[PDB]
Amino acid sequence: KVFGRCELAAAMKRHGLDNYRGYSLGNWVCAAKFESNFNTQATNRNTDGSTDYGILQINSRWWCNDGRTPGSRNLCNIPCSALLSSDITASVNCAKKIVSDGNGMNAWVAWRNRCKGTDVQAWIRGCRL
């Protein structure tokens, strides 16, 4: 599923990601835009052999099991394919764990390089939330 911008904002808010660990909703929408273009089905291989999955590009070395990643910890205790669902619940639950890990949203490279320090409220401008 390719979410619309405000559509994803509303889903993320309903799921309690807005202001989660102090990250306003625009941060999460901005991160999803650059990580996945709002596409739940997005996957990308990493150099280390792990793969990133879903709207928030959650990694198979630490967070989910994809059955092919050396050193997988599966800390979210989920198959990586569950993170590709049109229902974002599993991605949100796992993102809450990741962002609590100590580095906040710096865990997402695209967030640090493209969202951090910018006017992230722009990402939810116009939406009815």
Query: Among 51, 57, 59, 91, which residue interacts with Na ion (rule: CB under 5 A)?
Result: 51
Q: Which is nearer to Na ion, 69 or 91 (by Cβ)?
A: 69
DSSP state of 52: E
Query: Among 68, 100, 101, 113, which residue interacts with Na ion (rule: CB under 5 A)?
Result: 68
* Phi, psi at 23, each rounded to 5°: -95, 110
Nearest to 95 by CA among 48, 36, 49: 36
Is 111:27 a contact under the CB 8 Å cutoff? yes
Q: Is 101 annotated as a binding residue?
A: yes
The interface partner of residue 24, options being Cl ion, Na ion, none and the CB cut-off 5 to 8 Å by kind, is Cl ion
Q: Which is nearer to Na ion, 24 or 74 (by Cβ)?
A: 74
Which residues are identified as catalytic? Answer: 35, 52
Is 61:81 a contact under the CB 8 Å cutoff? no
The interface partner of residue 104, options being Na ion, Cl ion, none and the CB cut-off 5 to 8 Å by kind, is Cl ion
> Could you tell me how many helices (H) and strands (E) the chain has, helices first?
4, 3
* Binding status of residue 57 toward Na ion by CB under 5 A: no
Chain positions contacting Na ion, by CB under 5 A:
43, 50-51, 60, 66, 68-69
